[PDB]
Design a protein around this ligand. Structure first.
Ligand code: HEM
Length: 117
């Protein structure tokens, strides 16, 4: 049983990523980072990336987390905002606190790869 299956699999991930961007794009701490970003592309990469990270099929062909955020000099508060919006998304979609916490614990290992790059 992977975290991806516990979340609801493909149809749940396809609903979660756009809801997560609706929340990120309303969040003052982070929305502006995406001003010049093709959000269709980004939704597809982030769907593939979280699907792979959370134990679903691995079709992620994008950049690593350092290259993805290179030049942005991201700060801790920006990563906390992302995790908070993803947790709020999964909660709103009906995922239990225990599964959200498992997912956040995997994603949290990426923090050192993207901050201050
Ligand atoms: C720390 C706060 C973060 C901010 C502000 C942020 C912002 C961004 C932005 C603006 C881009 C696209 C740059 C462009 O248009 O080329 C991007 C790329 C990406 N980000 Fe983040 N990100 C953050 C954290 C995360 C986290 C926690 C993850 C996954 C755990 C993630 C996964 C990705 C992925 C998969 C890409 C696509 C890379 C590709 O296109 O090859 N980011 N990020």
């Amino acid at each position: 049983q992977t975290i991806y299956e516990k979340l609801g699999g493909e149809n749940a991930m396809k609903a979660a990523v756009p809801l997560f961007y609706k929340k990120v794009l309303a969040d003052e701490r982070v929305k502006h980072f995406f001003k010049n970003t093709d959000m269709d592309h980004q939704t597809k990469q982030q769907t593939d990336f979280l699907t792979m990270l959370l134990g679903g099929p691995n079709h992620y062909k994008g950049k690593n987390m350092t290259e993805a955020h290179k030049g942005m000099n991201l700060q801790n508060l920006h990563f906390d905002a992302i995790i908070e919006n993803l947790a709020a998304t999964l909660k709103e979609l009906g995922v239990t606190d225990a599964v959200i916490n498992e997912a956040a614990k995997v994603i949290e290992h990426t923090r050192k790869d993207m901050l201050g790059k």
